[PDB]
Amino acid sequence: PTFNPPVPYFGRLQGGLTARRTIIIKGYVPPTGKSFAINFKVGSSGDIALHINPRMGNGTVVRNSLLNGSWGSEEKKITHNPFGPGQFFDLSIRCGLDRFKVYANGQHLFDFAHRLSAFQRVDTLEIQGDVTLSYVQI
Numbered sequence: 001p002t003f004n005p006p007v008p009y010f011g012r013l014q015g016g017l018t019a020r021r022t023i024i025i026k027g028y029v030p031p032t033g034k035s036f037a038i039n040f041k042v043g044s045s046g047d048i049a050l051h052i053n054p055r056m057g058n059g060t061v062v063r064n065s066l067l068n069g070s071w072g073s074e075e076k077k078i079t080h081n082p083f084g085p086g087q088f089f090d091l092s093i094r095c096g097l098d099r100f101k102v103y104a105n106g107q108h109l110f111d112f113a114h115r116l117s118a119f120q121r122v123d124t125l126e127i128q129g130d131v132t133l134s135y136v137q138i
């Protein structure tokens with residue numbers, strides 16, 4: 001569950017995802033993979049505060065929230081894509097006060113402003129799809 005945890009990954013964030021808390025995800029994008037998702041979630045089957053979905057087909061890093069049954073407006077702007085076929089990556093995800101702060105391989109990837117009212121309503125990390133994880137710190 002910390003080292004080589006298989007997918008689908010399900011990890012409880014003890015307490016809530018409080019401001020200042022940083023989450024580490026090291027992984028490997030398989031050459032014959034299409035898509036994987038990192039979901040910061042309210043419970044095991046509630047709302048997704050941050051959905052990070054790299055898609056190998058169109059080389060896109062989609063961010064969105066699933067709130068009260070609906071997907072919001074997608075955020076896709078990046079200056080680099082670390083999730084290419086056969087690439088190892090090092091993700092650092094800090095829950096800020098007003099926004100998530102996400103770095104890839106030591107370089108800023110994106111910020112994502114909080115849509116959910118939770119600084120700490122977020123208590124579940126779900127990682128699923130075409131990804132091989134070497135290390136998840138929670």
Ligand SMILES: CC(=O)N[C@H]1[C@H](O[C@H]2[C@@H](O)[C@@H](CO)O[C@@H](O[C@H]3[C@H](O)[C@@H](O)[C@H](O)O[C@@H]3CO)[C@@H]2O)O[C@H](CO)[C@@H](O)[C@@H]1O[C@@H]1O[C@H](CO)[C@H](O)[C@H](O)[C@H]1O
Pocket residue numbers: 037039051053062063064071072074
């Ligand atoms: C079909 C699918 O892949 N479902 C996924 C789910 O994915 C969607 C999200 O990635 C959102 C984020 O904005 O995008 C959706 O597609 C957009 C597309 O990007 C647009 O360009 C287009 O105009 O609109 C569509 C529709 O909004 C994706 O469909 O993400 C969740 C969370 O990771 C997955 O759970 C879900 O997988 C399915 O889960 C189901 C149970 O809830 C079923 O088990 C199903 O088998 C899974 O494939």
